[model samples]
Target: MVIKLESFKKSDFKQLINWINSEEFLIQWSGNAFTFPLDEQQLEKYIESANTLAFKVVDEETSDVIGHISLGQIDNINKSARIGKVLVGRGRSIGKHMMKAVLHIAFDELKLHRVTLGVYDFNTSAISAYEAIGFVKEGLLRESKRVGETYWNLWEMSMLEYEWKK
Candidate 1:
């Protein structure tokens, strides 16, 4: 069963808003863009940019969305960046598939030269997953994101069209 990636519609706000109910998850996924207690207004503001595309990860058998991902800061003549407010339910291998699906969209469908993803330096699992899927460390943004009292560094990983195996 293949994990399906679909265009994010405005109607999917409720589920996403509910999934990320705490400030911890919000900052973990979204960085500094949104604050504690997620809301539709904050989400709408994030989607206002023209160079971004958000994706809803749908289950193969059940046909329900279980996670979210996005590609942002797109540069047509240069590299693209990913700032995803991702949500993955427990006991499900949702992250792996969604990451791959989004990569396919970035490399194969969009025909982009490069796509970079930003993750907190503390998120070891996410960094490992990105490495598993062929994304390598391109650069870093130090002390960039604030999670309440502490400022965390962001590590950017990238996969070029030539670097992607799929």
Candidate 2:
């Protein structure tokens, strides 16, 4: 699979909205209220901002966009970065394919020394996938956020270049 970071285009915004707003996919990943509107203008603003490194995950074979992944808050001085807001639009790219492709981009292509992400404790599948790809559980934040009436813990997971090299 080919993975590369490209400039965010306005044309891709609609696809992003479709992926994030899909109930079947969002229920487990994105817990936002369905009524909450997707702000394309805000996304456009983000694209203009220099801090965000956003890219569309595309399938080389069919030349189709499978999802989106971004590395934000990049710190060149510290050689640290946060991996956030990864989503696979199509169901077919779930599990191994998506994880492997994105992880490869983050580690291999980006050449980041360390990568970190926060996942909801309830997202066991995501935790498992990250662990499988070499992210270690650093700590857990108890009752990080309240989703509706229920509280959920937050898991802080990280992977270092050396660790991934192993």
Candidate 3:
């Protein structure tokens, strides 16, 4: 697996939509009513966000985009960043390989001192993955996300640079 942090391009919007529209995946994260194929305007606006670090995860051998992950709101002074919007396009990609590759980039290549991410409380697999990767549970926000008719908690997890292995 190869990870590259690049600017969001219009060409990648279709793949982004495909991932968002995957009911099996989106249903677990975005529960509310979301239309398939986001309009060009919305995609453009999202790309305009200053703090967004969007990237396409590609398979080294096939060079196919298999997923997307980002670290937004990077605070250089504090040496911390918020990891958000982590999604693997294919179910098969979930496991140690992708997580290990991405986490290494965020901690080692990016030289971020503290990397943090929030997981929906109901997403047991995601929580377990982060924990396995050395992310410590920092806190839990009660009823933080409103998905459909019910509310869900958000688990905040973080990892320090010193804990990362290159």
Candidate 4:
């Protein structure tokens, strides 16, 4: 299957809206720092910030949409960016291919120096994928996320242009 990414459109909002099934899952992916029950209008509001983008991942062969991702707080002077809010419905390696594409956009297309992302501590597979793709574990926020009765840690990860280039 050929994986691809496309600019997010009005038509794609519905699919994204549907992929989110629960508050816990949503908070696990995107920090509850953003609005809950994310909607089309909120979608526009979310991506309206400077140098921020909202995009969709898709399979070129099946013409199937995979998920949504974003690059936020892109700074030209610092030559750095952050990747987050990776929401995907299904598929093994889907997140990995999507992140690899994200790196391509950051290092090749945009000529950025570094790109960073954050993930919850319990997400072992995602952390493994991040390591496999060259992201270095930078730090950890202890009990950063509280869900129901327990607190969850948040792990911060990053990749440099030199690393991506080599």
Best by lDDT: 4
Off by over 4 Å in 4: none
Which tens-of-lDDT digit does each residue in 23-114 have in candidate 3? 43554533332344455676676667776666666666676777766667788788788777676654533544555665676778778898
Cα lDDT tens digits, model 1, 5-94, are: 787777988888888768877888787667777777877876776888888888888888877888777777775556476666642356
Count of clashing residue pairs in every prediction? 0, 0, 0, 0
Instruction: Please report, as a residue range, the 10-residue window in candidate 1 with the lowest summed lDDT.
Output: 83-92
lDDT tens per residue, model 2, 1-166:
5544455589998877766654434434433323335558756866776656777777777777776666676777777777766675534335446555555766798777888887888778778878887789999989866656766787989988898779
Residue pairs that clash (backbone atoms under 3 angstroms), model 1: none
lDDT of each: 0.77, 0.68, 0.68, 0.84
Estimate, for each residue in 1-166, the C-alpha lDDT of model 4 and write its tens digit: 5788898888887887777767787787678645568688877777666798878988888888878888887999999999988976655488888898888888899999999999998888889888988999999989988888988899999999999977
Q: Candidate 1: deviation at residue 110, Å? A: 1.7
Residue 132 of model 2 has an lDDT of: 80
Highest-TM-score candidate: 4
The lDDT of model 1 is: 0.77
Clashes of 3: 0
Q: Assess the local accuracy of residue 13 in candidate 2 as a C-alpha lDDT between 0 and 100.
A: 88
Give the local distance difference test score of model 2: 0.68
